[model samples]
Target: MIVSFMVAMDENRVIGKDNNLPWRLPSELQYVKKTTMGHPLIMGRKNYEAIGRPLPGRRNIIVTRNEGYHVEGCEVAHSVEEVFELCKNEEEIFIFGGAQIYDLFLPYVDKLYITKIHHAFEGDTFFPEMDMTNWKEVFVEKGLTDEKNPYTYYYHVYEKQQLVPR
Candidate 1:
C-alpha cells in the first residue's frame, strides 16, 4: 500500500484553528476527497471529531491512545505499527492529519499531497516542518479565488527521492 501524507496549510504553516480548517477552499477539499477515495484515511481522533463523520467510499482509520473510546464507521489504530497492520493489502493509504499524525508518519511517508493556501493565518495548531531534502517535487495545480472558492491555493504532490549519493 502507498503510505502518503496529505495536508492543507497556509503560508505560516497554520493548519487548524479550534479543530477545523483555517480557510475556505471548497474546490481544494473536493479534490482531496476525490483523490483520497478508495483509500484508507489515517487520522487522529481530534481530526475525526472535527470532521464528525466517515467520508463515504473510504476506510476511516482513527489513531488514538484510548482503547475504550470508540466511534461508529471507523477502526481505531493505537500505534503507527497498528495503522500499517490495519492497512494491509490496501491499494493505497492516505495519512490524513491534525499535525501530530503528520509528524508521527513523516519519516515513513512515500508521498505528500499538500494543499498550500497563499496566505498567513493565526492558528492554534500548525503543521510541523520537515526536512524536504529527501523529497522531490512531482506536480502542482495552481488555483485562484473566484465567485465560489474564496481563497488562493494550490494542490501539490511530492514523491520521496529514491536515490542517495554515496
Candidate 2:
C-alpha cells in the first residue's frame, strides 16, 4: 500500500496554531476533500478532536495512546503498527497530521500531497522538512483563492525516488 501525507502549511512550514490550522483557506479545504474523498485518512487524536466528527465518505482512523479513548464512527489505534494493521489490506492511506503524527510516519511515506501557502503565519506546530534529494515532484497545481481564501497556494505532489542496488 502507498503511504501518503495530505496537509497544508505556510511558507515557514507552519501548520497549526492553538490546535487548529493557522490560516482560513476554504479552497484548500475543498482541495483536500476532493483529493481524499475515497481514501482512508489516519490522523492524530488532537487533529481528530479539532474536527470533532468523522469526515463522511471516507474512513477515519485516529491514532492515540489513550487506552480508554473511543469515538463513534472512527477506529482508534494506539501505535503505528496498529494503524498499519488496520490498513494492511488497503491500496493506499493518507496521513492527516498534527506535527508528531507526521514525524512518526514520514519515513514510511511514499507520496506527499502538500499544499504550500505563499504567505507565512504565526504558528506553533511545524511540518518537518523532507529531504527533497530523495524525492521527485510528480506535479503541481495552483489553488484558487477568493474573499474567503485570501492566501495564494499551490498543491504539490511528490513521489519518493526509488534506487536500484546491484
Candidate 3:
C-alpha cells in the first residue's frame, strides 16, 4: 500500500505550537478534509488529542504507546507496522501528524501533499526536513484566500522516487 502525508508547513518547516496548528488557514483545513475524506488516516496520539475527536468521513487510526487508552470511532495501534497491517490491502493510507508520527512514517510514505503556508511561525513542533533529492514536485497551485478566508497559500504534491534495486 502507498502511504502519504497531507499536511501544512511554514517556511521554517514548523507545523504546530502547543499541540495546535500555528496557522489559521481554513482553506488548508478544507484541503485536508477533501483529500482525506473516505480514506484511512493514521496519526499519533498527541495529534488526535489536539484535534479533540476523530475527523468525520474517515477511518481514524491512532498510534499510541498507552495500553488502555481508547476513543470512540478510533482504533489504536502501537507502531507503523501495525497500522500498515490494518490498511495494507487498501489503495492508499494518509499519515496525518504532529511531528513525531511524520518522522516515523516518512520512510514508508510514497507521496506528500503539502500546503505551503508562506509564513514562518515560532512553533514547538516541526515537520522533518524533506529531502528534495528524494522527492519530485508533481503538482502545485499558488493563490491567495477566497471570500471566506484571509490567508495566502500554495498547494504542492510531491512523489518519492522509486528506489532502484541493487
- The lDDT leader among the candidates is 2
lDDT of 1: 0.88
Ranking by TM-score: 2, 1, 3
TM-scores for all candidates? 0.95, 0.96, 0.92
Better of 1 and 3 by lDDT: 1
TM-score of 3: 0.92
| Pairs that clash in candidate 1 | none
lDDT of 2 by residue, 1-166 (tens): 8999998999999998989887888888888899988889999999999888899989899999998899999999999999999998988899999789998898799999999999989998898988988898999999998899998999999998878898
Tell me how far the alpha carbon of residue 75 in candidate 1 is from the true structure, in angstroms, after superposition.
0.9
Local distance difference test, per candidate? 0.88, 0.91, 0.85
Scored by lDDT, model 2 comes in at 0.91
Rank ordering of all candidates by lDDT, starting from the highest:
2, 1, 3
Candidate 1: where are CA atoms >4 Å away? 164-166
Off by over 4 Å in 3: 143-148, 162-166
